[PDB]
Structure formats: C-alpha cells, structure tokens
C-alpha cells in the first residue's frame, strides 16, 4: 500500500525575535478548540533558505515521481506537480484542498497532479510553523470568531506596512506558543483589550 507521510513542522526559536508572514491556516490535530491557532512562515532566515531552495531544485529535477496506487489520503502529504519540473510538497488538508506546506498557500486538490513524496524529500520539516496565541483564555462566545480574526491577522502586516515579528514563548506538543507583534502593537494585548479573552 501507499506509505502515509506526515511531515513535521518548523520550530520557532525560544524567546528569539523572528520576522514572520502570517499565511493560510494549516489545521492540526494538536490545537484545542479554545486555542486561537495560526500558521506563520518565518522569513529572511538564511540558514534554512539554501536548504529549502536546494530541495525545490532537486524536486523539480527528480526523475522518479511515482503516483499513488489509490490517492493522497486526507491529512497526509505528497507532492503537487502543476507542470513538468514544477514540484512542491503538499498536505491534503481536506477533500477538495491541498496545502503547500513550504509556502503557506491553499490550492485546489487535483487528483491527476498529486504524486507520492519521495523519502529523500521527507527530511525537511514543513517551512510553515504550527502556532498558537499564547497566554489567553478565550470567551466561549468569541471562539466562533477565530476564522474572522485569522483573516484580520493575515492582513495586519500589510495594514501596518511593516513586517510582523513573533517570539516563541513555549511549545505545546507540535504547536509553537507565540507572541505576535508589530513594534509596541501586541496581538494578545489588543484582543484582551476587547474583552473577548483574558490572560492566563
């Protein structure tokens, strides 16, 4: 049978300021219903840049891209080939959607363009980082707004005309517990100020 592949995700450095882009939400079984989760893509990280760029070069040149006997199972990983020598790593996050785990973009599931992820390309974690907003107890009435809040947060850096920064405060399973901020504008502080959540 086909091997069911699930890439781990990139860790953020503890108590270290990093530059991040808020990307499309990658769901994880490791997020509690009342944890405000979000997906970050650390940017301007030269250490990993050459590694990811090298991976994509080899993936595009890879000869032995094999198809699934059956198909990519939901929740698991393979590759998406949108054209010859254009190959990227994906997770089938739902029946109709793939997630480009190294770019932070959701695209439509195309059965014919999906192939297995070769073992040699399973060593790099997803470039995106699974994250959760640290230090908060959310009002139950607010939890339904998490999607809307994520959309706002995705555009926050653009509206600030600034690169957002993050700092991992800890780790809960596979989730980076982070603060997200732009200068003195701290996400948890502005949410807490609206009374939809309280500090732990």
């Amino acid at each position: 049978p086909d091997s069911m592949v699930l890439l781990s995700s990139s860790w953020l450095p503890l108590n270290k300021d990093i530059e991040v882009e808020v990307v499309d939400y990658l769901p994880s079984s490791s997020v509690a219903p009342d944890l405000f989760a979000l997906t970050l893509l650390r940017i301007n990280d030269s250490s990993m840049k050459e590694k990811y760029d090298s991976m994509h070069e080899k993936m595009n040149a890879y000869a032995q891209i094999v198809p699934f006997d059956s198909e990519l199972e939901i929740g698991y990983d393979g590759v998406f080939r949108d054209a010859p020598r254009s190959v990227r790593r994906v997770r089938r996050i739902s029946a109709t959607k793939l997630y480009l785990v190294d770019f932070g973009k959701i695209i439509n599931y195309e059965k014919a363009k999906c192939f297995q992820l070769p073992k040699v390309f399973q060593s790099m974690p997803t470039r995106v980082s699974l994250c959760g907003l640290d230090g908060l107890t959310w009002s139950p009435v607010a939890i339904p707004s998490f999607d809307n809040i994520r959309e706002v947060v995705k555009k926050w850096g653009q509206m600030e005309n600034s690169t957002l920064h993050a700092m991992a405060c800890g780790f809960q399973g596979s989730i980076n517990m982070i603060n997200l901020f732009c200068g003195k504008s701290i996400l948890a502080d502005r949410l807490q100020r609206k009374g939809v959540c309280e500090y732990l």
Binding site: N148, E151, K155, E160, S185, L187, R193, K194, V196
Partner: peptide, 12 residues
Amino acid sequence: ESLLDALLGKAL
C-alpha cells in the same frame, strides 16, 4: 484606538 483595534473590531 490602534490600527489593529479597528481590524479586530470588524472581525468581531
């Protein structure tokens, strides 16, 4: 009222 305030206000 910050910029992010306004953003969050519409989401809520």
